[PDB]
Amino acid sequence: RPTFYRQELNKTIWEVPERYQNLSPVGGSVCAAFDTKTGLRVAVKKLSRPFQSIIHAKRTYRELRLLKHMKHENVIGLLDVFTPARSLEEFNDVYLVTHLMGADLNQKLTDDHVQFLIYQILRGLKYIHSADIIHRDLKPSNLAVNEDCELKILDATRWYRAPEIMLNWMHYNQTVDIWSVGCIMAELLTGRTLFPGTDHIDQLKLILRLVGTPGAELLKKISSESARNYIQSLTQMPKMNFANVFIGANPLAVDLLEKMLVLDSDKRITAAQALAHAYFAQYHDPDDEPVADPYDQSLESRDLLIDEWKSLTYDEVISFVPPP
Numbered sequence: 001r002p003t004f005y006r007q008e009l010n011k012t013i014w015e016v017p018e019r020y021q022n023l024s025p026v027g028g029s030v031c032a033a034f035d036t037k038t039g040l041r042v043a044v045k046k047l048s049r050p051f052q053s054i055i056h057a058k059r060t061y062r063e064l065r066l067l068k069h070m071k072h073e074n075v076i077g078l079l080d081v082f083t084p085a086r087s088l089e090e091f092n093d094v095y096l097v098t099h100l101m102g103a104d105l106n107q108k109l110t111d112d113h114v115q116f117l118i119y120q121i122l123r124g125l126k127y128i129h130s131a132d133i134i135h136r137d138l139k140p141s142n143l144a145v146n147e148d149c150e151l152k153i154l155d156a157t158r159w160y161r162a163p164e165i166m167l168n169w170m171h172y173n174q175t176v177d178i179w180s181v182g183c184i185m186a187e188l189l190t191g192r193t194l195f196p197g198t199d200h201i202d203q204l205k206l207i208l209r210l211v212g213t214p215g216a217e218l219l220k221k222i223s224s225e226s227a228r229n230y231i232q233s234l235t236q237m238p239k240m241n242f243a244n245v246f247i248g249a250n251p252l253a254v255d256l257l258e259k260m261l262v263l264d265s266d267k268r269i270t271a272a273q274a275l276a277h278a279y280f281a282q283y284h285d286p287d288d289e290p291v292a293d294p295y296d297q298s299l300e301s302r303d304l305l306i307d308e309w310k311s312l313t314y315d316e317v318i319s320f321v322p323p324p
């Protein structure tokens with residue numbers, strides 16, 4: 001067990017191992033710190049009220065288990081997790097430690113830089129998706145970069161949300177995340193938000209303007225009678241020429257965008273397919289685009305008692321093994 005020290009911070013007593021020095025509030029709650037053991041600048045998140053209720057406790061367990069699973073260069077991972085508690089009976093607080101990411105993606109980038117950034121997002125998404133996990137909220141603020149432009153996917157604007165999420169469809173496929181990637185890529189290339197909707201319905205209006213209204217193949221897949229009737233009450237419109245939306249862009253970028261931003265989610269390119277697209281030729285390397293171990297989301301989604309979630313979470317803290 002490390003020697004701990006106590007200090008009042010962000011108006012609560014933080015108790016952390018002495019290896020973590022010079023904590024400073026960056027806003028549960030996150031503080032930047034310097035890890036003297038590794039020489040790393042880190043973020044230390046003290047979870048807020050982690051076991052106050054069944055819902056808090058279930059959320060805490062899910063967050064910790066997910067972060068423990070993610071072991072990929074382009075996905076945020078867990079450097080450390082600790083509690084001052086020496087037993088289950090004393091266990092009230094949980095602290096999560098990650099790389100301190102100084103910048104994110106949130107005015108246009110060069111094509112060579114867009115290649116590199118989107119490659120890394122897709123490499124990370126291949127890994128997430130291979131664990132049967134959907135991110136569901138990819139956006140520039142969830143994409144951290146360092147001073148060598150190395151990117152990590154992290155963890156409320158609607159500008160990057162797939163249209164089926166906007167319609168509360170459910171049955172979401174992992175290409176909801178590919179829609180988001182397309183929106184981000186477009187914005188990096190043009191320096192302008194692709195679909196800057198003013199409210200919920202305006203977002204959908206702007207989307208349909210680019211991609212066109214549903215065709216017959218897509219209409220055939222709609223179970224909702226009201227949706228079906230609304231769509232066939234609509235005035236049919238063609239897909240815009242993406243070449244004209246992205247004037248002067250690399251033709252391979254435009255092609256890839258056309259393959260991401262398709263209304264029908266079944267027809268969107270996958271992360272793995274996208275990595276093999278010619279746009280990424282200078283980066284693609286099959287030998288090093290790894291997949292994840294299986295992740296069991298059913299362990300979440302149980303209806304357990306607070307003390308059961310708390311004990312399971314404690315076990316996950318004790319079993320943590322740091323990365324190299």
Ligand SMILES: CCCCCCCCO[C@@H]1O[C@H](CO)[C@@H](O)[C@H](O)[C@H]1O
Nearest residue numbers: 070075076133134135136153154155
């Ligand atoms: C840290 C690893 C990268 C993130 C991959 C896991 C995606 C996070 O999980 C997401 O977050 C939300 C929780 O509020 C939920 O709406 C969804 O169940 C889920 O898509």
Ligand SMILES: CCCCCCCCO[C@@H]1O[C@H](CO)[C@@H](O)[C@H](O)[C@H]1O
Nearest residue numbers: 167201204205224226227228230231
């Ligand atoms: C998949 C089909 C989605 C159903 C959309 C529900 C209705 C959309 O919104 C409606 O349409 C009109 C045009 O914006 C407006 O008159 C109204 O603001 C609104 O009631």
Ligand SMILES: CCCCCCCCO[C@@H]1O[C@H](CO)[C@@H](O)[C@H](O)[C@H]1O
Nearest residue numbers: 163164171172173221263264265266
């Ligand atoms: C007028 C607005 C229409 C929006 C159409 C969105 C269609 C998204 O695509 C759909 O999404 C689902 C979720 O994975 C799937 O089950 C379908 O097979 C698929 O066609």
